[PDB]
Amino acid sequence: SLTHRKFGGSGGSPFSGLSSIAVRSGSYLDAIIIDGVHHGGSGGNLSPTFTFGSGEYISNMTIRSGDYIDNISFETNMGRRFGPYGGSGGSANTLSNVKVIQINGSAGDYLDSLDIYYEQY
């Protein structure tokens, strides 16, 4: 069962465990790079790094996918855009009015899958 729990007091300023995303891409996403840590192969070309500012989160994302992740694009609450990166195969799915919390997945020579954890508004 997916949940969250807060521990501790009311002070300080909020932070997120997710800080940056880049991809390698060609016809597919060869790799996703999350907070600098590479997952996937060495093919394609490396994208610039998107670093989240304070309080900035993915609010909308379009992923093309089939057996792999073909393409990713996203927009943040601050109206900044990443991508599209990758190719034109697969089929498209969109998340809208969300707050992405975490990205897990699976990868070999390419990025096979993404598990997006998010809050749906």
Ligand X SMILES: OC[C@H]1O[C@H](O)[C@@H](O)[C@@H](O)[C@@H]1O
Q: Which residues bind a copy of itself (CB under 8 A)?
A: 1-20, 34-37, 39-40, 63, 65-69, 93, 95, 101-108, 110-121
Is residue 67 a contact point for ligand X (CB under 6 A)? yes
Evaluate whether 98 touches 119 at the Cβ level (below 8 Å).
Answer: yes
Burial class (CB in 10 A: 0-12, 13-18, 19+), 74: buried
Q: Which of 47, 59, 65, 76 binds ligand X (CB under 6 A)?
A: 65
Select 11 or 79, whichever has its Cβ closest to a copy of itself: 11
Nearer CB in complex with a copy of itself: 45/113: 113
CA dihedral of residues 99, 107, 33, 20 (deg, nearest 10) = 10
